[PDB]
Design a protein around this nucleic acid. Structure first.
Lengths: 366, 170, 260, 180, 161
DNA sequence: CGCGGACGAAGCC
DNA sequence: TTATCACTGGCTTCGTCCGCG
RNA sequence: AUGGACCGCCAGUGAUAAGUGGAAUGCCAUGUGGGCUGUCGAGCCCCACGCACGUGGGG
């Protein structure tokens, strides 16, 4: 019931996701600093690939009022009536008079205080609900403190509509806790197998028209980067995913597309300058029945180095997987796919020739 | 401990340098290079016997050579951070820029310190800044066991002594 | 008769429990601050696996049901020590920004800037269970069997659920040591009162350190304690901890058998 | 545009150099001291992507995208950065080129060379053979219909995995760009 | 490892040279087809191959007058004791420490065969494994040789207090 | 029509 | 160089209103 | 059985977009590795023959 996926994937001079100053995020793990890719960024990359591939798109936005106003304006409403109606849409919900709004900024509709995570057709449906009550909104816009008119139950029922991404990753909305959905996927922070020092690159920007001052004395800012073999891990709690989507077939399609996306996507951090697009060197899917088990402790002892880390990392994940299967006996269906052929890697179960074949076999096995 | 042999290297060398031109030129050709590299073997003949983990030996060779590659204008217990801050306040070097170079060295590894270090230290000794080479040596030796600790000491010493030097100019 | 368990479970970059602020809970011990996961949080998780797996031994083994009125047995005869890191750990800040999907004719003014604190380390976990009170209160010795065996495996397997969807901290303990002691419970916490130095990892080093402390305490007090330990490494022997076992459930079986 | 790194590990080679003072001075000749500038050599691996749909969105027309892409690829092979060349004439054409037209996703072959080559013998052949082996392994691990193709100077190997071989770089570029 | 087979070569070969002249003359001609007469004695125990064959042949080409420490310590003790030139053996050491696997075997024979001249003790097994260590860590073995030489020279000079 | 559950009324600036 | 910077709650008794059965 | 026993701070999250380190440079002038030197009786057993000096076959 717990599909867990392990992966080793090298990235060369990538710097995919930066802190506020441009340095790659680092973990002092095992006593040694190791650059890491934050889980939320990669989770976003996976959800964008999954939504792009399955066609259903979810929207996490803080500025819903402006968007509903644009749709109502395309429905034939005047601009001011569209703005007042969308304000009614967000005002008619929540315990108190309404959803908290940020200070109004000149010329634009106010942004909601909290981010919303709902499918696009749900936004269109909110526009329709605000549309059928056109006269009530028209009369209430004249009042100094307009109150919510739209039915609260209908709007709350529309905000409960679930996308595949919400079923898989979950959502949270504090003012309306009935709509909050628990995520079915756990996404670990991808860290390097070996300790990596941040390498500093000194770059300059050339001024094209010649000037004496332009060259000689002038110097240009230094930008940080890093490279390494990241270890990646993720869980999918199948019973919760089946409860969220409801049907088991949609859960199967969601999981398969998710795993394939998980392998395929890359966070895109300064990629127009580094081109770090790369496939994982090793993938290990397991269908665990008792509990998901990450193999991050296998690499808590940093690798020494001087020689290529991929082979040593694969052998270490293999060896650690064997020892865990001995120490924790289980009937979990294991399986792997690797590019190197130098080793058989006996503990990782039955070998599959390709990543899609592996994913299909494993997901079909659950 | 280590500091004892380091002091032997500082007097010896510093004494074997200004008092020798061929040895000075034979040891200076190996600044910022591994002791393993053939190009510095001409240096072992002077420094090899005092090497008291492996990181050390790299430390002694390093400093010794870098200490030896200075211009004559620079030839003839504080750390390196305090020396840098006092060099900023006194000699008027750039503060904000020496600042980023300090912040880049404090992250390096044992092999990175010896490749990022020569520009700031040799340029620091340029314009006659005082540098206690013995402490620097033991510091380069301290990268093998506590890299982050020594880095933190260097940076802290720099900012603290910069602040105190600015406040004492009241 | 007290059976106590010591585990050296490591956790990757995670924030399993946290303070009223974002930072994880920390105990300044040995002069070095070190992250901890409080005892009640891990214990509540244990309570859910034990009670879930059992389908009133839960008001006996653990003190009292949270949602039930006191039934004159509020104590539990189970003592969870607060897990704390073997080494000193600086809280590692993770700067994160929520992305605004709809974009105006301006660029990247993201939805939400923030920074949340996280940390990773090798926690030294510890617990003891008072068999005698458990037998006197439960009655049937077989109920005691399932309670202690099932409780022990639960002790190993579970991990608290806190910020786990953002960090997958699921893991198995690297070392487990169950010592059926008749004299008194002893925690090997002071073995790590001097935080271990870093840069090469800690699993092996922490294992051997715990071995030294077990050796010495057994020297000062030679006892009839039945012991045994299981590790995920076969490279190093730890003679002071007892006989080696191939696996965790085998060990738990041998020690529950040893208790009766 | 990816950062071109060496396939093999390279130590920086310090190059001692002096500048002769033309009007004779007796002491200067004996002293003869000047600074040392450091160089390096090696077989670089180079990689680059062109996201065609976005380029068509930028230029608007598909025909201008074709001229831009074809001319870009040819420029990519032909040009060399020219940093410190009047002193070292480093003008060189790539020993091997492998264009692929991926529809699902671009895939760089940088992991193929994360294990540095040992050396003592010429790295060109071993690098080409390794890129071949890794390309084979990726088509095996990641099945795809991407149109591949290569052009190489060495004839010691056929390099079966890099797709259909084209005799010349402009022929390869023209075939591939016309193929997209 | 390697040192085990190396010791087999040192005893076995150390006996054939001092014992049988035809084999001694057939292996010494290879210090290439011209050394194939040597395989018949050394080939079955074998970058390491080049090491073994060369060291056995060179070990075998010594004069009869010549028939765990390294080579540097043997050289320094030979300088201090036998009174060889110090500064000159110094540059030859510094030239070998830079050679590649093929250069060590072409610069090595003069110093080692001349060192064994005037009966200097040389542990051939360590030398063999050293020549084997050029295939993987040339610079490392070179550094060990030189360091051992200077350190043992210094200690031998200081102990003569 | 009955029962259950949820929110409000201050005190408070 | 510029834009972005969350919510929610851990008070008192009872009554009334609303949703449900 | 300890101002204690029972006891979750916790549900969410791209750090983003952009970038030559560039121009110039002899490590040059000087040097024996020299003298000395012929490579000229134990070998362990069986057997055969023998003038018991030794000869011959096999290991």
């Amino acid at each position: 019931t717990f599909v867990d996926i392990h992966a080793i994937q090298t990235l060369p001079y990538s710097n995919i996701n930066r802190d506020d100053l441009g340095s790659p995020k680092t973990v002092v793990y095992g006593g040694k600093e190791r650059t890491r890719v934050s889980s939320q960024s990669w989770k976003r990359a996976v959800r964008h690939e999954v939504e792009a591939r399955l066609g259903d798109k979810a929207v996490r936005t803080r500025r819903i009022i402006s968007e509903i106003a644009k749709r109502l304006r395309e429905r034939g409403w005047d601009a001011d009536l569209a703005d007042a109606g969308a304000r009614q849409v967000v005002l008619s919900v929540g315990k108190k008079s309404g959803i908290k709004l940020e200070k109004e900024k000149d010329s634009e509709a106010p942004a909601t205080s909290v981010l919303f995570y709902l499918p696009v057709p749900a936004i269109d449906e909110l526009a329709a609900i605000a549309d059928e009550h056109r006269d009530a909104v028209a009369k209430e816009a004249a009042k100094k403190t307009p109150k919510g008119i739209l039915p609260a139950d209908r709007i709350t029922e529309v905000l409960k509509s679930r996308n595949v991404s919400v079923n898989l990753f979950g959502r949270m909305l504090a003012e309306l806790p009935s709509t909050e959905v628990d995520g079915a996927v756990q996404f670990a922070h991808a860290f390097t197998v070996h300790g990596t020092t941040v390498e500093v690159d000194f770059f300059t920007a050339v001024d094209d028209i010649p000037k004496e001052n332009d060259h000689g004395s002038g110097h240009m800012n230094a930008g940080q980067f890093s490279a390494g073999t990241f270890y990646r891990y993720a869980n999918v709690n199948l019973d919760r995913l089946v409860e969220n989507t409801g049907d088991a077939q949609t859960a199967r399609t969601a999981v398969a597309e998710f795993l394939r996306a998980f392998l395929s996507t890359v966070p895109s951090g300064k990629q127009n300058a580094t081109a770090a697009m790369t496939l994982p060197d090793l993938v290990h899917i397991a269908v665990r029945f008792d509990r998901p088990i990450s193999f991050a402790p296998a690499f808590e002892t940093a690798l020494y180095g001087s020689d290529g880390y991929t082979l040593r990392a694969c052998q270490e994940l293999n060896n650690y997987a064997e020892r865990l299967r001995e120490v924790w006996p289980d009937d979990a269906i294991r399986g792997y796919a690797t590019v190197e052929n130098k080793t058989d890697l006996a503990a990782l179960g039955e070998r599959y020739d390709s990543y899609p074949a592996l994913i299909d076999a494993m997901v079909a096995a659950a | 401990y280590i500091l004892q042999h380091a002091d032997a290297l500082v007097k010896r060398v510093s004494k074997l340098i200004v008092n020798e031109p061929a040895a000075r030129a034979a040891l200076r050709r190996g600044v910022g290079l591994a002791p393993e590299d053939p190009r510095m073997l001409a240096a072992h003949r002077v420094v090899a016997p005092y090497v008291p983990v492996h990181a050390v030996e790299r430390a002694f060779y390093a400093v010794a050579a870098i200490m030896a590659a200075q211009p004559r204008s620079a030839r003839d217990r504080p750390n390196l951070g305090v020396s840098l801050a006092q060099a900023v306040f006194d000699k008027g070097l750039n503060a904000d820029s020496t600042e980023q170079r300090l912040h880049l060295i404090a992250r390096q590894n044992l092999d990175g310190v010896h490749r990022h270090l020569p520009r700031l230290v040799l340029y620091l000794r340029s314009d006659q800044v005082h540098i206690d080479w013995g402490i620097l040596i033991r510091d380069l030796a301290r990268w093998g066991h506590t890299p982050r600790h020594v880095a933190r000491e260097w940076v802290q010493d720099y900012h603290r002594t910069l602040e105190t030097l600015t406040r004492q100019a009241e």
